[PDB]
Write a protein that binds this ligand. Sequence first.
Ligand SMILES: *[C@@H]1O[C@H](CO)[C@@H](O[C@@H]2O[C@H](CO)[C@@H](O)[C@H](O)[C@H]2NC(C)=O)[C@H](O)[C@H]1NC(C)=O
Ligand SMILES: *[C@@H]1O[C@H](CO)[C@@H](O[C@@H]2O[C@H](CO)[C@@H](O)[C@H](O)[C@H]2NC(C)=O)[C@H](O)[C@H]1NC(C)=O
Ligand SMILES: *[C@@H]1O[C@H](CO)[C@@H](O)[C@H](O)[C@H]1NC(C)=O
Ligand SMILES: *[C@@H]1O[C@H](CO)[C@@H](O)[C@H](O)[C@H]1NC(C)=O
Ligand SMILES: *[C@@H]1O[C@H](CO)[C@@H](O)[C@H](O)[C@H]1NC(C)=O
Lengths: 49, 98, 412, 49, 66
Amino acid sequence: NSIAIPTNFTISVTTEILPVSMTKTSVDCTMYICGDSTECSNLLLQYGS
Amino acid sequence: NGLTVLPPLLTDEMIAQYTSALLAGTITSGWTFGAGAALQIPFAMQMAYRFNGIGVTQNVLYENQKLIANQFNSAIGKIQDSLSSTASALGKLQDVVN
Amino acid sequence: NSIAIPTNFTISVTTEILPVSMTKTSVDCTMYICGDSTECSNLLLQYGSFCTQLNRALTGIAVEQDKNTQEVFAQVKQIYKTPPIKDFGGFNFSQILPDPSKPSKRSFIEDLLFNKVTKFNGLTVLPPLLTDEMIAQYTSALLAGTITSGWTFGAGAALQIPFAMQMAYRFNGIGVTQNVLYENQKLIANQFNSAIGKIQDSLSSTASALGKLQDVVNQNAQALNTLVKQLSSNFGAISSVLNDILSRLDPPEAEVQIDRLITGRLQSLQTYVTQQLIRAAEIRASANLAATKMSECVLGQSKRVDFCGKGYHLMSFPQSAPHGVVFLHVTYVPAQEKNFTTAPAICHDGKAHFPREGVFVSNGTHWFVTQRNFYEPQIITTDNTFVSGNCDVVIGIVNNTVYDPLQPELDS
Amino acid sequence: QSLQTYVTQQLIRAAEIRASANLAATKMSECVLGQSKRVDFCGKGYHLM
Amino acid sequence: YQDVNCTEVNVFQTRAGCLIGAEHVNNSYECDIPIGAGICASYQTSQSIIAYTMSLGAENSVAYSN
Ligand SMILES: *[C@@H]1O[C@H](CO)[C@@H](O[C@@H]2O[C@H](CO)[C@@H](O)[C@H](O)[C@H]2NC(C)=O)[C@H](O)[C@H]1NC(C)=O
Ligand SMILES: *[C@@H]1O[C@H](CO)[C@@H](O[C@@H]2O[C@H](CO)[C@@H](O)[C@H](O)[C@H]2NC(C)=O)[C@H](O)[C@H]1NC(C)=O
Ligand SMILES: *[C@@H]1O[C@H](CO)[C@@H](O)[C@H](O)[C@H]1NC(C)=O
Ligand SMILES: *[C@@H]1O[C@H](CO)[C@@H](O)[C@H](O)[C@H]1NC(C)=O
Ligand SMILES: *[C@@H]1O[C@H](CO)[C@@H](O)[C@H](O)[C@H]1NC(C)=O
């Protein structure tokens, strides 16, 4: 037979932080593996796609 | 080495314009801009609806409007003090970068 | 001191299209890495379980496509069927209900969706457990339940309710007073019927509307084409054709050339399976979002804003599509905005008065109370409003008068 | 092999970001554009705005 | 036998492949061990493995009226 009822209130503001995106990197797989090398690039082609 | 970074389509300025629009909508038209047209509403009345929505009769807002506005204004000032001093506050975004 | 209350609405049906499963591919890796070759197979055994964990990973993806499809569609304990007579208060579902004339008894709009969407090397495609004819019994059950019984078939057994009383219930859900339906029932029925008409025009004309489902089918087809093309690479070997190595070299030399091909084909299969495992998580999160929208939008009415497209949500009708689902989300959108002066409260006999429901508004000479979502003015009385406190407290209160329904009954 | 490792990690990480972005989008609609009846969805306490 | 005809291999041809050893039963039941293409199998009656088109649930019309 007992209830607690609030008699006053407070307005609070909280901050919620969420990631939305990540850096749009791009890597040139040929230049990374065989940078400026014809001999290496031709070998790389043997790996297809 | 062939590693480059592409820019985002939406620049920081464009994002700011969107948050501005969402904020201006929220303040001057409540939720009506979400459903359809932005229908202007006195801010205090908008808050009255927000109070009814949590099970608190609207007269509470009006009778305590000065208190509520003061608590709100103080709460925002506290947000600034926290963000300006606690680096860890943005850890969720800093971690992505790292 | 100004509130805009819309004097009219429009009912908008918005299509939302969701992937729900993807092609149940499965690959006999021991055939892909070494095809009909004993010499190669014996070398592939030196890699232990690198094959059976790929047979296993792809089987895990293939098994869960039926889990996704069962969780999205099988949300109903019985196959409900529509009555013979279509006495739905003017609403016309005939374009979303089954066509008994068809061999697989899809609706008219399900046939548009099934039209707009388009090996020997150990690769296979396992069938779904639910045929597209069984998916169409489940969406017809969800839909014949939704039409005849509202949300109640999600809570218990289906309880029948007339469709003009089911939409009156959903109008109270968006806070619009249900007489705004009955006083406009032909206009609302006609806007629903006309908005279902636009869905056919969209889906018949514009093949790019299905873009998510065709993207999922293209990614799976592009991955298989990449996987099959990767059989043609040498990977440092004298030849990509295993039989040409074996027919030309003695074992002490053939094994070296074969190991080069095995390494390349195994890494190239692990690449496919890793891409499919990440792509299956991307579809599983879309199946759980489709299952959640089925449960909250179709079996219910959602209070979540913009969950069921733009507008205040009224109801949704599921239609099936190849490896997906489509929700025809019906929403109330308020349309003809009007301007009014507005008051937070009203002063009468020293007391302050506030609206139990609705907004105090002024066309410019008189004050009325009215629901927020639809301009419907009412003379302000003790039945529309409650007293709390007095005039000296509210900021921006106005000195109108509030009428008492008892006075003339005791005055006369 | 190094690139494959990198790309795989980026795809997995991207999925995490996407899930966060989806959550953020959900909140924007059901928190900023509306009012949330969902508990602790929009901070602790009874959500107003 | 997945994706084959009952040629090269109590035989039931399904779109999932050629199923051998399971009795084809006209009665539908709740799905137990899924095969594919609407077909599931189970061990029932004296007992043997049976195959059937799975039931999607009981049929129940709603007594809708204006
Ligand atoms: C509810 O609590 C607020 C404080 O959060 C009370 O307002 C304060 O009242 C004291 C006097 O007792 C002042 O010294 C403070 O400066 C006031 N603070 C603010 C922010 O106004 C308020 O009176 C309480 N209300 C009730 C009904 O008890
Ligand atoms: C605002 O609405 C009220 C009520 O409709 C208008 O006052 C009535 O106007 C009609 C038409 O002129 C008269 O027949 C009534 O006798 C008026 N009294 C009532 C019923 O309140 C009022 O004119 C409207 N605002 C404007 C445009 O002045
Ligand atoms: C309300 O008043 C503004 C004044 O700037 C006007 O632009 C707007 O069109 C008016 N709305 C209606 C519905 O008349
Ligand atoms: C099996 O072959 C027969 C012809 O002998 C053909 O009619 C039947 O459709 C084939 N079934 C399958 C599943 O390929
Ligand atoms: C199903 O019943 C039909 C008669 O309507 C019969 O010809 C057919 O052989 C039965 N099939 C099985 C699997 O019992």
